Ligand binder design. Structure first.
Ligand SMILES: COC(=O)c1ccc2c(c1)NC(=O)/C2=C(\Nc1ccc(N(C)C(=O)CN2CCN(C)CC2)cc1)c1ccccc1
Length: 291
């Protein structure tokens, strides 16, 4: 759609060697791959490649090329999943090469660390959890500055790479039910602000609500929000009137206070991601203080 600077972005297909799919979805697939020299050094880096499936409608091609263009628009930040390059020229498939985050989505990761957590000292600790939280806030402050709205901020959509760096991704009902297991899905409604459940309107301050739900997910070590409750039209009703989740098993009091601040029923009275970054950095620095 928008102009495309091939000098900056085009990567040669003959320096890309595809491996196995990391995941396959309704509209495309993400393949694990090796790229030679994509960061301008003389190195092989494992990257992830968004590309189409073998079916592939012109609407599915147009969408990937739109995502590529939007990624170029957003630009780089440590705490988003970054565009590394693309292959768009005649001679092969459309491929959008992005950062590989080896540990996978954060929800699944945290659930896997439940017998490997200690509040403070290999293991996860409060330091890790407030870190992940600050990093997602830093990531979202950046996206707000690019005038983006995420619309589906959840711990499933946060990826973990090396050195406890965590990165926001914008992507089940899809996957083959013969192969579907217990947490292989998530009900997005549980992350939606009252004004979005109800009026279907997305803003950056509705993303601040979902960030609160994400915080809850981090500090439950990857449990599902609203435990027990069935999500009917009275869930909604109660939600719009003031009902909120209880503190999860691994929260500190300050972090639970922050969830509740992010769940202000009134969008303008929720913290901004700039205010969350400042407050969460304070909490992070306090946590590792000494005597
Ligand atoms: C805009 O950018 C994007 O949109 C985007 C989207 C997805 C990913 C991405 C960028 N970048 C990644 O890394 C992604 C995934 N990554 C992944 C990583 C590790 C795993 N895990 C834990 C494995 O075990 C995989 N394992 C395979 C074998 N080799 C040897 C090692 C890695 C699984 C998925 C992933 C993709 C599909 C769905 C879930 C996540």
């Amino acid at each position: 759609r928008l102009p495309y600077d091939a000098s900056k972005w085009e990567f040669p297909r003959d320096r890309l060697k595809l491996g196995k799919p990391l995941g396959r979805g309704a509209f495309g697939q993400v393949i694990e791959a090796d790229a030679f020299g994509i960061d301008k050094t003389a190195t092989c880096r494992t990257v992830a490649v968004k590309m189409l499936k073998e079916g592939a409608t012109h609407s599915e091609h147009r969408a990937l090329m739109s995502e590529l263009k939007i990624l170029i628009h957003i630009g780089h930040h440590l705490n988003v999943v970054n565009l590394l390059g693309a292959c768009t020229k005649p001679g092969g498939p459309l491929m959008v090469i992005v950062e590989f985050c080896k540990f996978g989505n954060l929800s699944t990761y945290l659930r896997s660390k439940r017998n490997e957590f200690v509040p403070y000292k290999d293991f996860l600790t409060l330091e890790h959890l407030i870190c992940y939280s600050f990093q997602v806030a830093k990531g979202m402050e950046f996206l707000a500055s690019r005038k983006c709205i995420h619309r589906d901020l959840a711990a499933r959509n946060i990826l973990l790479s090396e050195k406890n760096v965590v990165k926001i991704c914008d992507f089940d009902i899809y996957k083959d039910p013969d192969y579907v297991r217990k947490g292989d899905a998530r009900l997005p409604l549980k992350w939606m602000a009252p004004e979005t459940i109800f009026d279907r309107v997305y803003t950056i301050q509705s993303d601040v609500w979902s960030f609160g739900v994400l915080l809850w997910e981090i500090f439950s070590l990857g449990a599902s929000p609203y435990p027990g409750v069935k999500i009917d039209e009275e869930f909604c009703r109660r939600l719009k009137e003031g009902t909120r989740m209880r503190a999860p098993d691994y929260t500190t009091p300050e972090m639970y206070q922050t969830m509740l601040d992010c769940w202000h029923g009134e969008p303008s009275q929720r913290p901004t991601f700039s205010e969350l970054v400042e407050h969460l950095g304070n909490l992070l620095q306090a946590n590792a203080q000494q005597d």
